Design a protein around this ligand. Structure first.
Ligand SMILES: Nc1nc2c(ncn2[C@@H]2O[C@H](COP(=O)(O)OP(=O)(O)OP(=O)(O)O)[C@@H](O)[C@H]2O)c(=O)[nH]1
Ligand SMILES: Nc1nc2c(ncn2[C@@H]2O[C@H](COP(=O)(O)OP(=O)(O)OP(=O)(O)O)[C@@H](O)[C@H]2O)c(=O)[nH]1
Ligand SMILES: CC[C@H](C)[C@H](N)C(=O)O
Ligand SMILES: CC[C@H](C)[C@H](N)C(=O)O
Lengths: 168, 240
């Protein structure tokens, strides 16, 4: 499956989805599909806006995050410190999206972190994880596309509410 | 230069620009830079929303289009028949972005057409033109992405305009109903002295009237007081 074909899944979702707002659950599932990754889309404060997970659902810690609708405040803080795309992060790096208490299971895991920016502001983080294979530049194109477009969507959303708080 | 580097140049514009709105004139420059193309971004009716031209600036017709801010209605109509990306279009093809009457300059040229879609609707067209070299998959990855975000941005402007429409109607109504009959009359009299026009029936009323309007956002005040809803005057008179 060519890179062109992969980028088209995201473009198709953006072009043809209903409503003015793209659903980040849909976006997470599309990225998950074309990069074969566990996917988190999180807010500035680590609220889970969308996810699409496979192996990670076998972790009760992960499951609890999903119930709480937040990643851990510590991981959130560490994601906010990542200022540009950081890729192929290993299981011993605190930036891993995999639970370090399952080190043997995820020994070859790779994590890539995409800061989400819009309107010149940090609006969230896109996090992708694989149990095995390294990310390559094509994966990065897809990730940064996705991150850019999520950023446009959050930016529009927040300016809808900020100008509705400006009414007051 | 890698595709990743090209996408980042575009993404930097999208992520870091100022204002809520992406300026399509900037997008055309950036698309042109990372694909080495002559670029048109056009609306459904062929208005040029952004262009980045080089070799095409030689042609007099092109200069004329730029000055009218429109591509020809004929070509506009031809673009609207392209429903999928069509690439590497040559000079003797009706879809070329190059002027056929300058065939000799553009004999090896290639045109790619990218429909701009949003919310299940055609919103415009991104057109790329190169003098020499064929378009490859990198160019299409960049071009279809660019077209997608332009579509999102057109969709956002349109929606924000139907929104401002509804906000203003609601704002005018909310104010009008807050006015007593006297205040309505005072406001009419105010504009029988102001045709834009300055400050300076008793006094407490006229002031009370204008304060209800400033608070509903129908007028703003400075030494001076204007309407920023160009529809308030009619709706006022009709409310008596
Ligand atoms: N288009 C789109 N926007 C979303 C979606 N989910 C959340 N948002 C927007 O994303 C932004 C962040 O989500 P919030 O619900 O405010 O969560 P938060 O942690 O309080 O966000 P922060 O302001 O970063 O702290 C808000 O503007 C939401 O409106 C989604 O699925 N699609
Ligand atoms: N974000 C953004 N939107 C733009 C820009 N230029 C034009 N638009 C929007 O693109 C849409 C089409 O442009 P128009 O100015 O309406 O030209 P038109 O020929 O009347 O467009 P149509 O109604 O589609 O036929 C409008 O909703 C504009 O607001 C731009 O530079 N940035
Ligand atoms: C989603 C957070 C991940 C699992 C992080 N490495 C942690 O251990 O908390
Ligand atoms: C931009 C329009 C172009 C030049 C088209 N091929 C024409 O000849 O009109």
């Amino acid at each position: 499956m060519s890179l062109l074909s992969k980028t088209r899944e995201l473009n198709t979702l953006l072009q043809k989805h209903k409503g003015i707002a793209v659903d980040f659950k849909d976006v997470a599932q599309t990225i998950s599909s074309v990069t074969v990754t566990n996917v988190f889309i999180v807010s500035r404060r680590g609220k889970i806006l969308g996810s699409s997970l496979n192996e990670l659902l076998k972790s009760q810690r992960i499951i609890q995050m999903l119930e709480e609708r937040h990643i851990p405040s510590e991981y959130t803080e560490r994601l906010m410190e990542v200022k540009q795309t950081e890729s192929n992060i290993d299981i011993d790096n605190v930036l891993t999206v995999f639970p370090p208490e399952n080190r043997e299971l995820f020994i070859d895991s790779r994590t890539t972190i995409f800061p989400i920016l819009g309107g010149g502001e940090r609006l969230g983080t896109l996090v992708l994880g694989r149990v095995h294979d390294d990310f390559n530049e094509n994966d990065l194109v897809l990730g940064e596309y996705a991150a850019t477009v999520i950023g446009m969507e959050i930016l529009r959303e927040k300016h809808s509410e900020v100008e509705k708080e400006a009414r007051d």
